[PDB]
């Protein structure tokens, strides 16, 4: 029994992160690849497939293996059923908190951020229905990242509804530098005091439209973070927990630079850590994503920190959890009007459609194919390599709710523009230098944009300017001076391009629904357009 655990410690943290508004049970496969430059290979955040199972001592075919790796995915999805769903997550959280309290324990419900956005329910209520669900379950704290794509005003509004206490040491006014929210909160846990410090994603300005966060700075400030930890302890905190949305590698670097952080609950990177990652004098536990798991962290505290801890990744399996009737009732009420829109099949996929990967996915290829089919003049389609999304099983129907799960940006516009061949290589080399940075302190936690219509060779360990080679567009060598017509959504690439005259940008999801409804069935087979030097590029089994 995964959920039946004996008591342990003075305090229990019930933690999830990066739900990305996923209201319903769904499928979410881990990436087939998490390519690292040599210096970073074999670390948590860079483990996939069989390697991840071995690292954590997880047996193949188990519920944990199903959550942790792409290995046997389709087979395990049919065996254990879908993951997540606000209903099941709520039921699990409620079960766990009741056990702990009945033990005489103290349980905190911590949300790592990236909760309010990127789903049908979210887009339909501009995030509000997600905030309401949060209040139903009882979230004690949360940090943020994508929340800000709602715009400063809407966030300000929703925080008025949010019953938990929002934290962040780094969101400050861009002129005066005064923090807008509390950096941390101290909770009494028996005779001890536990401080929960919050950190929001520091790269919000360059990752989303600048207008969403005008007047704010989210910059990483070690001096300021260190000072908040020092203050928490001065005020009585025995132990310090960082509820983070920096990204796990950045969290790791901080563990070696900041003093006094005992545990980091790492969001943003969508990682899974069945056993805590020990860095310096800190333990790190990742928050997974899309509601697939509830991390239960039991702490035995001492006057100077965390003496020991028990970490359990609890799978959120809807077929094996009781119902949270109030959550189910609330969702039916919230989405009754939109049932037909959200859940009517648009098309049936014959193969596995997955999103997560360093370089390539079948979902993103489907999108490239959809764009080219509707805009035949397009030569290259740049798809955003976000880590949020969903997974479609073979024979499963694709719905609007799925489209919003995959492309539910608040700025979902597809842009058509010309790029010179030299800009194409430069863009890839640029992304490559960010993703394959050998220094974790500079890591931003993203993947490489998928470019449909081109093929290339990548050397993660080559010097900057030399990582991308042998570029080919439409079966011919890349010509640096030729103007290629490109398409791109969810990013900023259009800013350096020459807009296609006569084209009016429109939401990527409209283009996809139009395509899907027409073809009725899709069968995208994995055909990676990249060759990785020094690495074995892996693929999942897409049938079954």
Binding site per annotation, positions for Mn(2+): 18, 20, 114, 145, 245, 268, 270
* Strand 345-349 to 396-399 pairing: antiparallel
Give the contact letters, 305-344, x = binds to Mn ion (CB under 5 A), - = no: ----------------------------------------
Toward Mn ion, which CB reaches closer, 233 or 402? 402
Number of amino acids touching Mn ion (CB under 5 A):
4
Toward Mn ion, which CB reaches closer, 192 or 201? 201
Query: Measured from the CB of residue 464, what is the shortest distance to Mn ion in angstroms?
Result: 25
Q: Which strands make up the sheet holding 192-199, listed edge to edge?
A: 184-189, 192-199, 239-244, 263-266, 282-286, 277-279
Query: Measured from the CB of residue 268, what is the shortest distance to Mn ion in angstroms?
Result: 4
Residue 447 as a binder of Mn ion (CB under 5 A): the answer is no
Select from 80-88, 115-123, 143-151, 428-436 the region that touches Mn ion (CB under 5 A).
143-151
Sites for Mn ion among residues 470-489 (CB under 5 A): none
Toward Mn ion, which CB reaches closer, 21 or 315? 21
Query: Measured from the CB of residue 490, what is the shortest distance to Mn ion in angstroms?
Result: 13
Max CA distance (Å), the chain: 70
| Dist CA 368 CA 382 (whole Å) | 8
Q: Binding Mn ion by CB under 5 A: which of 13, 14, 15, 18?
A: 18
CB 202 within 8 Å of CB 254: no
Toward Mn ion, which CB reaches closer, 116 or 436? 116
Query: Measured from the CB of residue 151, what is the shortest distance to Mn ion in angstroms?
Result: 17
Toward Mn ion, which CB reaches closer, 12 or 269? 269
CB 186 within 8 Å of CB 135: no
Select from 145-153, 316-324, 413-421, 460-468 the region that touches Mn ion (CB under 5 A).
145-153
Query: Measured from the CB of residue 445, what is the shortest distance to Mn ion in angstroms?
Result: 7
The DSSP annotation for 410-461 comes to: SS-EEEEEEEEHHHHHHHHHHHHHHHT-S-TTS-----PPEEETEEEEE-TT
Sites for Mn ion among residues 343-382 (CB under 5 A): none
Toward Mn ion, which CB reaches closer, 268 or 372? 268
Alpha helices in 46-110 (DSSP H): 49-56, 63-68, 73-80, 86-102
Select from 17-25, 50-58, 202-210, 357-365 the region that touches Mn ion (CB under 5 A).
17-25
Q: Which residues pair with 398 in a beta bridge?
A: 347
Select from 13-21, 89-97, 212-220, 318-326 the region that touches Mn ion (CB under 5 A).
13-21
Query: Measured from the CB of residue 266, what is the shortest distance to Mn ion in angstroms?
Result: 11
Residue 268 as a binder of Mn ion (CB under 5 A): the answer is yes
Toward Mn ion, which CB reaches closer, 291 or 305? 291
Toward Mn ion, which CB reaches closer, 114 or 128? 114
What are the backbone dihedrals phi and psi of residue 7, each rounded to the nearest 5 degrees, phi first? -60, 155
Give the contact letters, 56-95, x = binds to Mn ion (CB under 5 A), - = no: ----------------------------------------
Q: Which residues pair with 301 in a beta bridge?
A: 306
Residues belonging to the binding site are: 18, 20, 114, 145, 245, 268, 270
| Dist CA 294 CA 321 (whole Å) | 13
Query: Measured from the CB of residue 146, what is the shortest distance to Mn ion in angstroms?
Result: 6
Instruction: Give the closest residue to 23 by CA, choosing from 246, 421, 249, 339.
Output: 339
According to DSSP, residue 58 is labeled P
Select from 268-276, 338-346, 448-456, 491-499 the region that touches Mn ion (CB under 5 A).
268-276
Give whole-number Cα distances, 148 to 86, 385, 407, in Å: 21, 19, 17
Query: Measured from the CB of residue 111, what is the shortest distance to Mn ion in angstroms?
Result: 12
Toward Mn ion, which CB reaches closer, 69 or 144? 144
**173 membership: H or E segment, kind and range:** strand 172-173
Select from 139-147, 304-312, 406-414, 528-536 the region that touches Mn ion (CB under 5 A).
139-147
Select from 113-121, 319-327, 496-504, 534-542 the region that touches Mn ion (CB under 5 A).
113-121
Q: Binding Mn ion by CB under 5 A: which of 114, 262, 271, 357?
A: 114
Query: Measured from the CB of residue 209, what is the shortest distance to Mn ion in angstroms?
Result: 16
Toward Mn ion, which CB reaches closer, 269 or 423? 269
User: Crossing angle for the helix pair 362-374 and 400-407, nearest 10 degrees?
Assistant: 100
Determine the distance from the C-alpha atom of residue 166 to the mean position of all C-alpha atoms in its chain, rounded to a whole number.
Answer: 19
Select from 158-166, 177-185, 263-271, 450-458 the region that touches Mn ion (CB under 5 A).
263-271
Residue 30 as a binder of Mn ion (CB under 5 A): the answer is no
Residue 310 neighbours by CB under 8 Å, 6+ apart:
8, 9, 297, 298
| Dist CA 167 CA 197 (whole Å) | 7
Q: Which residues pair with 521 in a beta bridge?
A: 348
User: Crossing angle for the helix pair 362-374 and 508-519, nearest 10 degrees?
Assistant: 90
Q: Which strands make up the sheet holding 521-522, listed edge to edge?
A: 396-399, 345-349, 521-522
SS (H, E, C) 299-337: EEEECCEEEEEEEEEEECEHHHCCCCHHHHHHHHHHHCC
Query: Measured from the CB of residue 267, what is the shortest distance to Mn ion in angstroms?
Result: 6
Where on the phi/psi map is residue 311: left (φ > 0), alpha (ψ -120 to 50), or beta? Answer: beta
Toward Mn ion, which CB reaches closer, 49 or 446? 446
Q: Binding Mn ion by CB under 5 A: which of 94, 145, 292, 467?
A: 145
Select from 69-77, 85-93, 112-120, 460-468 the region that touches Mn ion (CB under 5 A).
112-120
| Dist CA 178 CA 332 (whole Å) | 42
Which residues of this chain interact with Mn ion, rule CB under 5 A? 18, 114, 145, 268
């Amino acid at each position: 029994s995964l959920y039946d655990l004996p008591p342990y410690g003075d305090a229990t943290l019930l933690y999830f992160s990066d739900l990305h508004g996923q209201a319903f049970p769904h499928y979410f496969m881990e990436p087939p690849n998490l390519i690292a430059p040599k210096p970073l290979m074999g670390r948590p955040g860079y483990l996939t497939g069989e390697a991840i199972l071995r690292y954590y001592g997880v047996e193949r075919g188990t519920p944990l293996a199903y959550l942790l790796s792409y290995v046997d995915f389709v087979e395990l999805a049919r065996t254990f059923g879908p993951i997540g769903g606000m209903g099941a997550l709520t039921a699990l959280i409620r079960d766990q908190k009741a056990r702990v309290e009945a033990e005489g324990g103290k349980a905190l419900v911590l949300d790592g951020g990236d909760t309010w956005t990127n789903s049908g329910l979210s887009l339909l209520t501009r995030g509000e229905a997600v905030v309401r669900w949060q209040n139903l379950v009882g979230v004690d704290h949360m940090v943020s990242h994508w929340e800000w794509t709602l715009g400063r005003e809407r966030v300000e509004e929703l925080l008025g509804l949010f019953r938990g206490e929002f934290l962040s040491y780094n969101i400050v006014d861009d002129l005066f530098g005064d923090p807008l929210f509390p950096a941390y909160r101290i909770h009494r846990v028996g005779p001890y005091a536990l401080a929960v410090v919050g950190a929001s994603y520091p790269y919000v300005k360059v990752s989303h439209p600048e207008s969403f966060t005008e007047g704010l700075s989210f910059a990483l400030d070690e001096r300021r973070l260190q000072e908040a930890v020092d203050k928490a302890r001065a005020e009585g905190a025995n132990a310090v927990v960082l509820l983070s949305h920096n990204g796990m590698q950045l969290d790791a670097a901080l563990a070696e630079r900041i003093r006094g952080i005992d545990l980091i609950l790492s969001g943003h990177t969508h990682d899974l850590t069945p056993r805590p990652w020990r860095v310096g004098k800190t333990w790190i536990v990742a928050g997974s994503a899309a509601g697939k798991a509830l991390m239960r962290v039991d702490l035995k505290l001492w006057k100077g920190g965390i003496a020991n801890l028990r970490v359990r990744v609890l799978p959120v399996l809807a077929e094996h959890l009781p119902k949270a009737e109030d959550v189910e009732a609330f969702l039916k009420a919230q989405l009754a009007p939109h049932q037909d829109h959200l859940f009517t099949p648009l098309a049936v996929s014959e193969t596995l459609l997955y999103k997560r990967d360093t370089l390539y996915s079948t979902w993103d290829q489907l999108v490239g194919e959809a764009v080219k089919a509707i805009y035949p003049e397009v030569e290259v389609v740049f798809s955003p390599a976000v880590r949020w999304g969903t997974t479609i099983l073979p024979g499963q129907a694709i719905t609007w709710d799925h489209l919003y799960a995959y492309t539910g940006f608040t700025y979902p516009e597809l842009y058509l523009f010309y790029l010179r061949g030299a800009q194409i290589k430069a863009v890839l080399e640029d992304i490559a230098s960010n993703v394959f940075t050998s220094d974790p302190f500079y890591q931003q936690g993203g993947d490489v944009s998928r470019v449909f219509g081109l093929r290339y060779v990548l050397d993660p360990d080559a010097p900057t300017g030399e990582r991308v080679r042998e570029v080919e567009v439409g079966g011919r060598p890349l010509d640096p001076n030729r103007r290629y017509l490109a398409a791109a959504y969810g990013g900023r690439l259009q800013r350096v391009g020459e807009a296609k005259p006569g084209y009016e940008p429109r939401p990527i999801y409209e283009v996809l629904a139009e395509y899907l409804r027409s073809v009725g069935r899709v069968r995208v087979r994995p055909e990676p357009n990249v060759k990785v030097i020094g690495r074995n590029y892996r693929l999942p089994e897409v049938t079954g």
